[PDB]
Paper text:
Chitin is sensed in [name] by the hybrid histidine kinase [name]. In response to chitin, [name] activates the expression of the chitin utilization program. Previous work from our group demonstrated that [name] is a noncanonical hybrid histidine kinase that contains a DBD at its C terminus.
Here, we present the crystal structure of the [name] DBD at a resolution of 1.28 Å. Since no structures for close sequence homologs were available in the Protein Data Bank (PDB) to serve as search models for molecular replacement, we used the single-wavelength anomalous dispersion (SAD) technique to determine initial phases. The crystal diffracted to 1.28 Å resolution and belonged to the orthogonal C2221 space group with unit cell parameters of a = 51.91 Å, b = 78.61 Å, c = 72.37 Å, and α = β = γ = 90.00°. The structure of the [name] DBD revealed that it contains a fold that is reminiscent of the canonical helix-turn-helix (HTH) used by diverse DNA-binding proteins. Structural insertion between these helices is not typical; thus, the sheet feature found here is a distinct variant of the HTH which we refer to as a helix-sheet-helix. Consistent with this idea, the β-sheet insertion has the highest B factor (a measure of structural motion) in the [name] DBD structure, indicating that it is relatively flexible. Mapping these residues onto the [name] DBD structure revealed that all five residues were found within the trihelical bundle that forms the helix-sheet-helix, which is consistent with this domain playing a critical role in DNA binding. Specifically, these residues were located in the β-sheet of the helix-sheet-helix (R1068), helix 3 (R1074, K1078), and helix 1 (R1090, R1092).
Numbering used by the authors:
A (entry chain A), B (entry chain A): 1022 to 1128
């Protein structure tokens, strides 16, 4: 129902933002670099500056697309966890949010 | 010194035992299957029965070899975490023990 759909969207934003913050700290690379190196998100020239325009929409519930690319988000969480291994609460939180999303998508 | 060497051996046994218990529960497969499918540990015919004779020595501090194969143990932890994703305290403990071993080996 509407509650499950809104929960999925809230978890997707939490998971993506958490994963990017972890990527930035552990890899020492930018959000731009995650998109460019993984090939999972496109780079655009906006306001005369390179931007991960679509990825950026997934970092706030207000801008999340009407049709989220759930598999691309799960591939993003997997890519970040594949390249960033530092064990700890921050990583555990991303793993837990990944499992939550997967269970919501398959229930 | 002796303290660091004994700590490394104690952490190796904790990590291996933890990882195998997690593999068995999450994969629903045996220790034998972890060895056979990964190819990381040999199978032997002892007492007329198939056994992971060398791997078994890593599950008790009393039997741990004088010369542990540290890389084979780290490859074992990586293989189990690659195939078993269930997020939770049990998985976090294995990740934490893996990081502890790596830091001891590089300090």
């Amino acid at each position: 129902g509407s509650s499950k759909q809104d929960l999925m969207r809230a978890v997707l934003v939490e998971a993506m933002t958490s994963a990017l913050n972890y990527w930035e700290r552990v890899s020492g690379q930018s959000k731009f670099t995650f998109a460019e190196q993984s090939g999972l998100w496109r780079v655009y020239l906006d306001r005369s500056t390179l931007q991960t325009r679509t990825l950026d929409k997934y970092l706030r519930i207000e801008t999340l697309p009407k049709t989220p690319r759930w598999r691309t988000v799960l591939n993003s969480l997997d890519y970040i966890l594949e390249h960033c291994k530092e064990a700890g609460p921050e990583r555990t939180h991303i793993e837990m949010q990944r499992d939550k999303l997967q269970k919501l998508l398959t229930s």
